[PDB]
Amino acid sequence: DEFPIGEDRDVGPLHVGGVYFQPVEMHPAPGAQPSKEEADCHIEADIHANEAGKDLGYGVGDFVPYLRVVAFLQKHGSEKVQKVMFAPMNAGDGPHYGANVKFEEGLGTYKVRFEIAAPSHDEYSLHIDEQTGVSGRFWSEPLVAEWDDFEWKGPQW
Amino acid sequence: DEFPIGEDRDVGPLHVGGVYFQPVEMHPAPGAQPSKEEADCHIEADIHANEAGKDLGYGVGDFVPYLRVVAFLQKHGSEKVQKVMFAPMNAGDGPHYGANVKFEEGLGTYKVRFEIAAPSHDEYSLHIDEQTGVSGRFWSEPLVAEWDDFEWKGPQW
Ligand SMILES: [Cl-]
Ligand SMILES: [Cl-]
Ligand SMILES: [Cl-]
């Protein structure tokens, strides 16, 4: 049982989808994410190359590894913003950028914003020879996929 | 044009291929690798999950990111061993682990060994809960794909 954060987005060379479901147990446990027991849910940011996509050398539909994905959550009526740092991981259904999440502000409607940064300069490279290499270059400022009316009503499991 | 290092290998949950071709211009230029002009060739390790990889949650046949790949080159009859750190990068045909390399002891027959370590502890995780998790785990001892008789006969371009 998976529930959408909202409609999938196409931003630059990325096809971005967001879903949430029950908390999971991850090994190792990433950064400062809540445990399966402490968490409200698990949120997955699925990032696959789109047609644009190919200019960086990826095949359409391929998972795009080495990205740095963060989510910002803001409950409607509040000035507070919660930052969620996803981590790369595999589940039984494949790779994702994911995070166990506890909604600090509780039940309500949220603005949910994913910021997707390209790999760090020392973490990835592109072959750029004329004619034989790729023509595209990684984006400089993080790409954004946003949903303005995400409803968190508590566990649906 | 790509030239083979030797026969493809299946090691653990990985299918590993090795090819070499003319040195390339990479952006950013990775680690301490030689430039396109200084290098003898580019060596590429192609790594995809095999059937055993499904247990780690990878899609069978897909690229396996976040690994730490190092190549060791040793000319027959020599005690000198060159250590080459590979870096993740994209070419027109997708992601691979690779490096521009100089064959330090010149033309001849070399033993070529790729040692493939799992992702560092803080760089990747697996879901391990019953509902969404996997039953496999990352390997502790690095996996080895090696070719005892690679012939460096000079550029084929
Ligand atoms: Cl926000
Ligand atoms: Cl060796
Ligand atoms: Cl480690």
Swiss-Prot record, chains A, B:
Locations listed in the record = Cell membrane
The record's Gene Ontology cellular component field reads: plasma membrane
Its membrane topology, per UniProt?
A: Lipid-anchor
Keywords of the record: Cell membrane, Lipoprotein, Membrane, Palmitate, Signal
Q: Which family does it belong to?
A: Belongs to the UPF0423 family.
Q: What does this protein do?
A: This antigen is a pathogen-specific membrane immunogen.
User: What name appears for this protein in its UniProt entry?
Assistant: 34 kDa membrane antigen
What is the originating organism of this protein?
A: Treponema pallidum (strain Nichols)
At the highest ranks, the source species' classification is: Bacteria, Pseudomonadati, Spirochaetota, Spirochaetia, Spirochaetales
Please state the gene responsible for encoding this protein: tpd
* From-to range in the entire protein, with total length: 48 to 204 of 204
